[PDB]
From a paper:
We designate the reassembled cages as nanocrates (“nc”) to distinguish particles derived from disassembly and reassembly, rather than another commonly used packing strategy in which cargo-containing virus-like particles (VLPs) are derived from simultaneous expression and packaging in the expression host. Cryo-EM image analysis of MS2nc@ApoF reassembly showed a mixed population of empty and cargo-filled MS2nc particles (**[Fig fig1]**). From 5,000 micrographs, we selected ∼240,000 particles and used icosahedral symmetry to produce a map of MS2nc at a resolution of 1.86 Å. Instead, it was necessary to employ the experimental data for MS2nc obtained for each sample to calculate the shell density for subtraction. The nanocrate thereby provides a built-in resolution standard, determining the principal resolution limit of the dataset.
Being highly symmetric, the nanocrates do not adopt a preferred orientation at the AWI, and therefore their enveloped cargoes are randomly oriented.
Residue numbers in the entry:
A (entry chain B), B (entry chain A), C (entry chain C), D (entry chain C), E (entry chain A), F (entry chain B): 1 to 129
Amino acid sequence: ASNFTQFVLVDNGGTGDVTVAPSNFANGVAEWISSNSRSQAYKVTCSVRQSSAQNRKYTIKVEVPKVATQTVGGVELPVAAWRSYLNMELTIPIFATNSDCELIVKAMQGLLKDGNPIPSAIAANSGIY
Amino acid sequence: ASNFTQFVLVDNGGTGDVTVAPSNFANGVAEWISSNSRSQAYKVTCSVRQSSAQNRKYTIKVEVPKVATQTVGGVELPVAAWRSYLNMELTIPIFATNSDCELIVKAMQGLLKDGNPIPSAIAANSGIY
Amino acid sequence: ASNFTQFVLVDNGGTGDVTVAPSNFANGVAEWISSNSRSQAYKVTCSVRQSSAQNRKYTIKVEVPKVATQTVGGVELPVAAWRSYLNMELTIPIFATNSDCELIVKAMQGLLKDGNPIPSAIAANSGIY
Amino acid sequence: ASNFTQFVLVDNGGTGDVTVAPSNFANGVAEWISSNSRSQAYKVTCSVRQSSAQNRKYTIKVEVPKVATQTVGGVELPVAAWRSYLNMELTIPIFATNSDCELIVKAMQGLLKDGNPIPSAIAANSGIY
Amino acid sequence: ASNFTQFVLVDNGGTGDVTVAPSNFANGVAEWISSNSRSQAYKVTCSVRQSSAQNRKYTIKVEVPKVATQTVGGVELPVAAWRSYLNMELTIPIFATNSDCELIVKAMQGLLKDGNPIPSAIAANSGIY
Amino acid sequence: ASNFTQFVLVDNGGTGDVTVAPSNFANGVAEWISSNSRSQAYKVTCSVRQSSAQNRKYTIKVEVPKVATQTVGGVELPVAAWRSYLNMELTIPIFATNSDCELIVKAMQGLLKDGNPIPSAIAANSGIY
């Protein structure tokens, strides 16, 4: 069941979608990037290992470019002002079955579903109030 | 209106859905828990802070329990056999607009969407290859 | 093309086969793991290195679990009652051609072919008699 | 009945097979040797012992020669230019049944089956890629 | 689709072409080798890393052997009389777009094109004058 | 056989080609540049020497400007953000003949030929996957 394929990272209704495609598999770490320069591209990485005696840990990183007032192909500095970073670590005990892992995935999807407090706060440049 | 509202963490189609409701805002950490004992409850937390002069960081955590009944000293108690922990750290520059933040949210949603490589690998107890 | 793919480790006809899938490639050690619970999963690893100026060395390991349920204090977990461990080391001089390597592989396959003394002894809980 | 018999180590169709024959059983180590010159012969050994109170351990070794003629000072001798060495150790708990042992054997056979990653890598003078 | 595929390193017009095929990806270094013994094989390696915060560096290496047969202790072995080593280091800023990288590739191709000064000098065992 | 002449570094089908012409021969090091400012020009350098007792080494350097969003004739800073560097060293044993050197040149051309993994990865801002 090979799964290292391109996918739509940002869905805009079919027109203007952001697709990321495989770009590196060194050290077993899967990497996707969009069709941009490295400084302006969307980037996704994922790897999994045995973190402890009874846990496995998925390490997932996503980089998102700032698009407002962007100059496509230009040199934008400082780097920290134009990019957002997501560092996500999912720790799963070795006892969890496929059904348990499906439940965990559903939990993450519900956490980030549109209209829910966490995505609403992030999208509104706000905290919890 | 306040964004600190209850939401469906795990959507099973209307029956058996896991709902978490606001439970604490002490020390600046927003907390949600399911309607269970603290030993067996689902948990969601979220906080935001000025990580540096020009960046803001969201810290989001979710706990998924595997419930069980444990006999301790001849008495049965509701416990969790194990818990799966999700830890998310999201750093956003202060220069990001609302549209940029919406792009970040859509990126995360597309990352965790059903059928995509990372959720498929997590549900299948496997890495990316 | 790529040989870091999933393959059938145990061929139980057409139904009930044990398939292992790539999970990790850290430190140049390829690792395959079967699906469902990690505590009960099969494991295969392989790595190759230049052991001396004139020799290359393969290190191959396989773990076969006996699946069982553990119940301690009323809490049930999926575990391996015990595991069987295979450790293989194969040394091949740099002078060996592809034909020589194919001959070595055929030698190993004939070593483990059904009806031969060593697989018969292993399958019968017996030694050489 | 007896498993200390001659068997085909390398199956080159029907003509040119490499057969090894019993030669020695000293110190509980069974040894097979192919015919013609000992300096150029194939070698297979196998022994089993109680490694711990709960484990039995098989030690299996195979030597594959590269046949050549050595000429020193005008005197010609049949020698092995070099040898490939396989060392296998398999540990099986005393609790394993005959069915469990057959499963272990099938696991090894599937490990070395043609088209699988590890035999392909060995036969192609290659690692995992 | 994966870009880790075999390719013709030396094009002789269809007969006698030197082909290298993927052979290893351990430790993040992609390796290609020709269908020969390791002692006499052609070799290509390639790796990429974040050399600094704003630059990426490709490290590309090629080995061209001059094959021979050496008598060692009265036994003839396949060796390389000598090897020619090519070492390429290519540093690219993260701000470079795909078109910029295509310009880099075209520059290298034009640099090594038949009839040009540098390849003519290399083929003629001479410098530039 | 004088060979220090201008050549097409980047071929764009005859229109828009990038030509580099001789610009310096100090210290015996041949240098080519395009018709630009030194900060924005293509630059090629080449020299050869006896590197060791049994090896000669060609040292070849190429500088490529970032063209996307370029301001022709402008002051672009930092320098490291607008230029890519190739450092290529070819080591050839003193025993190699003209035919061997032609083979080495063919190897380099095949390495960098369009459609092959290394140029594809470089042009796609990607590694090996």
